Design an enzyme around this catalytic site. Structure first.
Site, PDB file in Angstrom:
ATOM      1  CE1 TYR A 129     -16.655  -3.040  -4.394  1.00  0.00           C
ATOM      2  CE2 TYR A 129     -14.980  -4.074  -5.818  1.00  0.00           C
ATOM      3  CZ  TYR A 129     -16.266  -3.550  -5.650  1.00  0.00           C
ATOM      4  OH  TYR A 129     -17.129  -3.510  -6.792  1.00  0.00           O
ATOM      5  CB  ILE A 177       5.516  -4.235   7.762  1.00  0.00           C
ATOM      6  CG1 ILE A 177       6.274  -5.564   7.639  1.00  0.00           C
ATOM      7  CG2 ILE A 177       5.407  -3.497   6.368  1.00  0.00           C
ATOM      8  CD1 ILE A 177       5.498  -6.712   6.998  1.00  0.00           C
ATOM      9  NE  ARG A 191      -4.402   1.656   4.265  1.00  0.00           N
ATOM     10  CZ  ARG A 191      -4.263   2.725   3.474  1.00  0.00           C
ATOM     11  NH1 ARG A 191      -4.935   2.802   2.326  1.00  0.00           N
ATOM     12  NH2 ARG A 191      -3.413   3.704   3.818  1.00  0.00           N
ATOM     13  CE  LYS A 231       1.823  -3.454   7.197  1.00  0.00           C
ATOM     14  NZ  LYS A 231       1.762  -2.717   5.892  1.00  0.00           N
ATOM     15  CB  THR A 273      -0.944   0.045   1.223  1.00  0.00           C
ATOM     16  OG1 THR A 273      -1.594  -1.217   1.344  1.00  0.00           O
ATOM     17  CG2 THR A 273      -2.016   1.164   1.040  1.00  0.00           C
ATOM     18  CB  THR A 274       3.730   2.342   2.096  1.00  0.00           C
ATOM     19  OG1 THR A 274       3.012   1.925   3.291  1.00  0.00           O
ATOM     20  CG2 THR A 274       4.450   3.637   2.361  1.00  0.00           C
ATOM     21  CE1 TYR A 285      -1.658  -4.344   6.783  1.00  0.00           C
ATOM     22  CE2 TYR A 285      -1.329  -3.930   4.425  1.00  0.00           C
ATOM     23  CZ  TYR A 285      -1.563  -3.463   5.710  1.00  0.00           C
ATOM     24  OH  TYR A 285      -1.692  -2.107   5.941  1.00  0.00           O
TER      25      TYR A 285
END
Lengths: 288, 288, 288, 289
Positions: D106, D201, D137, D161, D43-44, D132
């Protein structure tokens, strides 16, 4: 404020407070090393105690303890005038401190909370423990608000923080310059690692010695040993919230044959499914 | 139960209940067509009224109304023994029904909710309006629990539903043993469309007449005319929660020169910012 | 936009798009009164179609419909470049509108959303239905951002509103910038009462005729008759979200012997517990 | 296992293109500063807005530059199981040490849908896999019971994570899982390690790698007095990293410090002027200017 402060149950018998069971419970907690006792909080069933019973339970706790550990009197209300009467009584009856919950249900603004606790703080000279538990009260006491209170009133001394968002705990420790006490048994370890100084505890009613040990290792900075006890008590900790506190803690005390007795409506007996679960957890620990 | 039931403020003057102002308010509402009055609910600041004032306000509403519209008296509590006693009083004092809130803060299970409301139902012969507002109480009264209650007790008659998830309203209407009253002004129109029959209202303290017409249109099935008043009043409805009810409604009444007076702590005066918004809303409607 | 637009499933057979089943489904929905077809949205498993399957399904929907009713093409993506590409494709291939979801997962700001939807609106001349569903995307498209989009771009014509807080729908209607379509089957009746003009529907795939009738009764303002069907379909509408859409709808269609086939991972077959509930609901309706 | 600090690296852009030189320079900066490994194209790293081909080339560049000095964890998650397999197989083939794999977002699969999804990933490769979880999100929470089944079946299901801020989920994992817990939240890293997590992370380790590594090593060795000191010194910075949606703040911060980052890709966009100033003041206070 430092270490373990069990939020004691109020035991009942023949529909009345069980003053003898209370004394026996308090003495048990003291022999096992608690720093203090919180009398008539939520786990003490404050909502269902008469005005007169609330006073007699506090006085009984003050009289039994007789100075051997800190007595913190529950004195919160969602009515400011009542929170004042209760706080003044706690001082007059010889409590060492007051636990004062954020007004529940009527949802005051941050300014309301500031004004509310300000009245409370001006009413007495005792140290005050602010009590924030958004999940029950529908209001979050914000750290900036606590910082304002703490800087105005020297007796505003600690927060019992039960908001499970721990960055609120960081903000309190960083910005507010107040003692944080864990308001969630299972978050005591990580809150003490953050800078927290103890816990106002449900589970310490059942396992005071072990919880005291755990917290002492966490304060000393020995997390390896703290974790060991945390993980051992972990299922018991979950079981303490398997239905709303204090339904589990009183159920567990009854199962152990310690004083507790009945819950007052609208609180009531645990489901059978849930009982068996708690039953097994207590068995695994050799408690019964 | 049918139509608009303003939840009335408790006006104050000199730290006391303004009995003349109360009387002035009731007759204003009656004259504008309300079906009834809800006394000493949360909009009437029940949390900060003494036990004496509570009884005096309900007595005064009964006496002023004088059989002209229904008087529903606030009688809930998170202590069952206290709920029973308030309900008994409402009956003895001559009220037409009781509004009964789900215990707030102590978070009873659905079974504890059912036992609590059963005790209330058994204590009186008056019709009971159950009141669900999870965003304040931290507990949701589930439709299956209402169903079991309405099945057991014929005086369990309505629910004031302030859960904003309208599937809960559809479930109540579907599992059809009760009248649904809107517990949210801004959702009144869709709730009636769903089969709701009225509203227990904050805004109806301000615009009794207009709200009565909106509701009557919705009840008649004329949503074009209902939407037209909904939208006219929409900014006003929002301003009614710009801070916690009853802060805005009292503020608004003071603005209009009608009886209201101060808020009791921990409730307090609105933001300067928020008053400006309310002031402007009021102005656009020619109410000030 | 007015009336009922089913968000059609994408049927699969032997691991591939079932184009014949697709045709058959489309024809069935048209015969039974729908206003249009929404292709390759969430209910059509767009996240698990390759880019080439996505384009083909849309082409096929355009071709089968053959201009009879409006074709709304799923386009839109949490990557703006892809959303433009998908939208320009929908235009090129002969769709009549585009359905464009708020970016999911990457949580852009309101300004991000405005710029994202601006780039999409500039890329095509077709009408655009904005799609808001914070429960899936982790983002809420604010009524003020819609107002701003609608004012700058004349092809931003509607919003599919799946936020269950119907105040947001009142706000969208009060601005009057845009047609509101229901994003939730079970909130369709109350959304139309508020001034909504129809629904992008899941359950219309199962009971197109009945749902079309409910929605027309509601658009004509006959809520008595709209309510009868809403309550008749209520257990089905709940069954449609008993697990994440489209798992229930594909499950119901297979139980019914209609084209649907398998779900693509990570979606998978419903629990046996949930299957039993759904099957009884279908039996109560005479659908199996 | 996984231990210590793994920054989730940004993907820097120059002239609408991945900036490979900037990327290299960022990598060596973090390695110089003692990081345990690098997380690429999560994502980052703006995984949503990279092409397939950019994703592949970015992982490739990271493997090559790193050249075995630290662990390389390749983001390879998708809300489409077929694509998650493909990305994972690619990460293995290209030379990564491990895969980071996010719960599908989603489309909101059920727990069993999640198990089957991660089961197909685990069957596709022999690399260790970091699960993760970030419900804020994705709209889904991967439950510890589901993690436990995964790990019981698949030996390469190695870590989580954990970005769910309810830390009793973390103690349920430590208690039941037998997986390594990594912090998915910079500001919860210290309490997660106290609970027995083994590292993080991190977004903020892109800005202050040396400080974060050392805070983590203190918390790892059980010296929380010294972990706390660095946690509170970085606390305003850690809050700034989420002042708007990650990676808007971290890229804004790298640009301010004159490090490679460049622009954000839509629908991400520049920080508001008010948020910029708050970030600037915190950077100024730490002297990162």
């Amino acid at each position: 404020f430092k270490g373990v402060y069990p939020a004691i149950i109020t035991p009942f018998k023949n529909k009345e407070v069980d003053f003898d069971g209370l004394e026996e419970n308090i003495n048990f907690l003291i022999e096992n090393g608690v720093s203090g006792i919180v009398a008539v909080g939520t786990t003490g069933e404050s909502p269902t105690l008469s005005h007169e019973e609330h006073k007699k339970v506090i006085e009984k706790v003050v009289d039994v303890v007789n100075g051997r550990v800190q007595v913190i009197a529950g004195a919160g209300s969602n009515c400011t005038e009542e929170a004042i009467e209760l706080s003044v009584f706690a001082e007059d009856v010889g409590a060492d401190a007051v636990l004062s919950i954020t007004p529940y249900y009527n949802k005051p603004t941050q300014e309301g909370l500031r004004k509310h606790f300000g009245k409370v703080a001006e009413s007495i000279n005792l140290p005050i423990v602010l009590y924030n538990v958004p999940s029950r009260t529908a209001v979050n006491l914000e750290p900036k608000t606590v910082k304002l209170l703490a800087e105005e009133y020297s007796n505003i001394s600690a927060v019992k923080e039960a908001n499970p968002n721990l960055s609120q705990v960081s903000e309190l420790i960083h910005d507010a310059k107040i003692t944080v006490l864990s308001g969630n048994d299972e978050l005591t370890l990580p809150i003490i690692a953050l800078g927290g100084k103890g816990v106002i505890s449900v589970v310490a009613n059942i396992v005071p010695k072990e919880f005291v040990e755990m917290v002492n290792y966490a304060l000393e900075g020995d997390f390896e040993k703290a974790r060991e006890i945390h993980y051992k008590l972990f299922p018991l900790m979950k079981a303490m919230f398997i239905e709303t506190n204090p339904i589990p803690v009183k159920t567990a005390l009854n199962m152990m044959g310690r004083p507790a007795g009945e819950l007052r409506l609208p609180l009531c007996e645990m489901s059978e499914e849930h009982k068996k679960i708690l039953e097994n957890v207590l068995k695994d620990l050799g408690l019964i």
